[PDB]
Amino acid sequence: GLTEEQRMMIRELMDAQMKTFDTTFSHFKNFRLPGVLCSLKVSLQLRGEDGSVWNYKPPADSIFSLLPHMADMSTYMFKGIISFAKVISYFRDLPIEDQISLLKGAAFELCQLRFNTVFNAETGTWECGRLSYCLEQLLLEPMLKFHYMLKKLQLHEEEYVLMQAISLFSPDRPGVLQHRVVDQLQEQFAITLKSYIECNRPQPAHRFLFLKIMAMLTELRSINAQHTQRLLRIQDIHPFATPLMQELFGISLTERHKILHRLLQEGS
Amino acid sequence: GLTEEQRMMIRELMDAQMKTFDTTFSHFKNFRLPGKWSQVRKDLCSLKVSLQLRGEDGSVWNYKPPADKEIFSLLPHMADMSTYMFKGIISFAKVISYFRDLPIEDQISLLKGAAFELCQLRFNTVFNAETGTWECGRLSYCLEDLLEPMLKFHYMLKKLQLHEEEYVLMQAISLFSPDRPGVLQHRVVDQLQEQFAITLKSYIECNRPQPAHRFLFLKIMAMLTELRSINAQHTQRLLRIQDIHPFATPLMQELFGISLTERHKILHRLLQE
Numbered sequence: 234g235l236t237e238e239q240r241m242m243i244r245e246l247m248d249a250q251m252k253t254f255d256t257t258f259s260h261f262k263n264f265r266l267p268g269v270l271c272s273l274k275v276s277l278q279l280r281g282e283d284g285s286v287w288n289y290k291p292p293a294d295s296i297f298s299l300l301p302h303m304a305d306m307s308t309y310m311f312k313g314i315i316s317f318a319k320v321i322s323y324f325r326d327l328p329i330e331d332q333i334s335l336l337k338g339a340a341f342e343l344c345q346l347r348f349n350t351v352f353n354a355e356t357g358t359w360e361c362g363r364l365s366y367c368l369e370q371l372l373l374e375p376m377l378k379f380h381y382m383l384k385k386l387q388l389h390e391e392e393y394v395l396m397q398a399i400s401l402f403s404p405d406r407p408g409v410l411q412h413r414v415v416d417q418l419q420e421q422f423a424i425t426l427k428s429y430i431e432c433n434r435p436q437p438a439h440r441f442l443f444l445k446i447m448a449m450l451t452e453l454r455s456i457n458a459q460h461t462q463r464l465l466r467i468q469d470i471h472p473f474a475t476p477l478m479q480e481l482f483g484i485s486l487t488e489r490h491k492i493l494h495r496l497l498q499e500g501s
Numbered sequence: 502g503l504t505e506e507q508r509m510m511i512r513e514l515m516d517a518q519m520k521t522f523d524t525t526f527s528h529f530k531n532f533r534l535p536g537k538w539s540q541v542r543k544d545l546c547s548l549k550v551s552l553q554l555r556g557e558d559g560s561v562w563n564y565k566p567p568a569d570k571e572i573f574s575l576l577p578h579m580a581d582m583s584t585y586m587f588k589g590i591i592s593f594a595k596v597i598s599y600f601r602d603l604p605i606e607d608q609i610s611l612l613k614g615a616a617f618e619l620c621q622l623r624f625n626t627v628f629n630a631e632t633g634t635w636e637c638g639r640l641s642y643c644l645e646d647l648l649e650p651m652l653k654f655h656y657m658l659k660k661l662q663l664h665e666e667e668y669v670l671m672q673a674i675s676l677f678s679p680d681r682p683g684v685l686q687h688r689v690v691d692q693l694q695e696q697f698a699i700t701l702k703s704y705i706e707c708n709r710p711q712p713a714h715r716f717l718f719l720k721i722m723a724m725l726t727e728l729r730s731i732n733a734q735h736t737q738r739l740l741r742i743q744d745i746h747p748f749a750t751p752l753m754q755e756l757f758g759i760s761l762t763e764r765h766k767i768l769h770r771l772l773q774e
């Protein structure tokens with residue numbers, strides 16, 4: 234039994250998730266594709282409305298071909314992440330600078346949390362509806378070990394959307410001014426998540442699940458730093474980042490993120 | 502043991518083939534790709550193919566066709582494929598001396614009736630029987646699901662294991678068909694076809710064992726007869742489909758029939774340059 238606010242807090246996040254998560258990627262169009270890292274090698278599949286199936290197999294040892302597509306696809310995911318935060322009441326009340334700082338530090342993490350919901354552990358494929366991404370002693374790349382472990386927990390929709398709230402309202406993000414207001418918000422999401430697990434998962438397989446989930450968020454925070462550095466090493470060599478990704482990567486706060494600033498003011 | 506004219510007759514067709522047959526399809530670019538109604542779905546089910554497209558880096562794009570507007574996806578591509586092939590078929594005839602000396606209308610009539618047949622003969626050279634795939638260099642076409650006469654023709658012709666000289670002689674016999682619609686020089690073309698047929702019959706005797714290839718010439722002639730029937734069949738199927746869904750290129754519309762040189766001005770223009 235949750236409090237009348239904890240129940241109201243989850244319904245707001247679940248409604249926020251339903252309104253902003255395009256699980257089928259139906260509105261994901263006008264993206265780049267390979268024209269006619271070694272652990273994260275993926276094979277792109279693209280199904281059509283008529284039932285046709287395009288399949289792209291990347292070449293072997295010679296790798297920057299799929300990055301333009303993965304940049305466009307991740308940008309579309311982050312646009313839904315922005316809209317997810319805009320409809321949360323606790324997020325819109327924050328200053329416009331903290332909304333940019335929180336979305337800068339939680340862009341990658343909230344994308345991963347949504348990808349794990351469409352990840353297939355048995356087939357190794359990220360079933361993104363229209364598109365699919367199938368992989369080619371391999372769960373050492375922290376990106377994939379995180380997804381396989383998180384998928385093993387078999388979390389609910391309420392638990393996934395609560396991890397997004399805890400990751401979004403991180404008080405120790407670079408540039409956050411209201412560090413105490415964000416920390417007060419983050420504590421309530423963790424309390425609601427801890428209370429939800431106790432009321433709906435009495436099984437022994439889900440023992441210490443809240444501490445496991447919090448440990449995943451800490452690991453995902455470390456993987457966020459690793460991948461951001463790995464992608465800046467490639468951007469320095471081969472420019473592949475989208476205009477919105479350059480603002481996140483850091484390539485006066487609202488003046489350096491004019492796209493993020495405009496998206497936070499439009500009607501959600 | 503061929504005559505010096507039969508020897509020079511083959512040397513001209515081989516030079517004709519090597520100048521106009523892009524066996525690697527290196528110059529086939531800028532083609533379309535996948536982005537009375539009941540009478541169409543028949544042949545489409547028999548000729549369902551999966552397109553493969555390799556890249557310079559080694560990447561492989563593959564298009565699997567949608568299972569049973571459903572099969573109209575490969576039509577724009579195969580129209581560009583057929584058009585590119587036929588333009589090389591036109592260039593093949595434009596360098597043959599016996600073809601240039603014919604009237605400009607008889608040249609159009611021969612190319613109209615032998616367009617499909619000469620295109621199949623070149624497609625059989627790049628067909629892989631054990632894998633069932635037309636290996637067109639960067640492009641590949643593998644079918645799924647020998648009942649279709651066009652498929653039975655390719656499997657039977659590939660089993661004969663003909664030479665490059667025997668393939669180019671089949672193109673000469675099929676090109677110089679005197680009974681094509683609109684041909685005026687029935688006496689000249691029929692005598693030309695006999696000269697190529699005699700050379701093919703004499704080539705098999707002089708360059709192959711006698712008893713094992715005793716009826717190889719008659720088998721080849723039987724293939725051209727069966728291929729002549731498939732040319733009629735396939736032309737009717739695509740006229741039923743083109744009338745419903747336009748997929749034919751302007752050069753294909755002239756062949757399909759959609760004053761002789763004025764109704765085939767594109768084919769005429771390609772014969773003048």
Ligand SMILES: CCC[C@H](CC)Oc1ccc(C(C)(C)C)cc1NC(=O)c1nnn(-c2cc(OC)ccc2OC)c1C
Pocket residue numbers: 270273274275299300303304307308309311340341344345348359366376377380457460461464478481
């Ligand atoms: C399991 C993770 C999902 C994805 C498959 C569904 O896995 C990949 C697999 C293969 C590849 C390559 C090797 C083919 C390129 C890449 C990725 N994944 C990214 O490329 C990615 N993941 N997150 N972000 C991201 C987004 C962002 O907002 C726009 C800001 C910063 C971001 O990175 C700090 C990005 C760009």
Ligand SMILES: CCC[C@H](CC)Oc1ccc(C(C)(C)C)cc1NC(=O)c1nnn(-c2cc(OC)ccc2OC)c1C
Pocket residue numbers: 544545548549550572575576579580583584587616617620621624635642651732735736739752753756
């Ligand atoms: C058998 C080898 C060809 C090709 C390659 C594997 O197999 C096909 C496979 C599938 C398909 C569909 C049904 C899925 C589209 C078609 C075809 N092949 C044709 O559609 C074709 N073959 N020849 N011609 C042709 C050309 C011409 O010159 C311009 C004039 C008249 C012609 O037909 C009267 C055409 C149009």
